[PDB]
Amino acid sequence: KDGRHLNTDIPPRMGWLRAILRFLGAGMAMTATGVAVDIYLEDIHGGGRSLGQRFMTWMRQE
C-alpha cells in the first residue's frame, strides 16, 4: 500500500511467480474466519529474485 518496498521485486523474466503469489495471498484471506479481507503484499525475506530459484530447485528435483 505504501508503494514498492524494493524487496518485493519480481523480475521481468520469470513472471509466472505472480500466479502462485495470488494463491498464497488468497489462502489466508479465506482461512481467517469472518469477512474476507483485501490483502496486500508486504515482504519476501530472501528477495523476489531468490524466491523463485527455490521453486526452480524443486522443479529440477521434481
Partner: peptide, 27 residues
Amino acid sequence: AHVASHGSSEIQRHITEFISSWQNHAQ
C-alpha cells in the same frame, strides 16, 4: 541491537565479499 542487526540482494553479497577479503595496507 537486533533491530539494527538486519541491515538489492546481489549488491549485498558483492559488498560482503568486498569487506571480508583484505586486511593489510638482521645486523
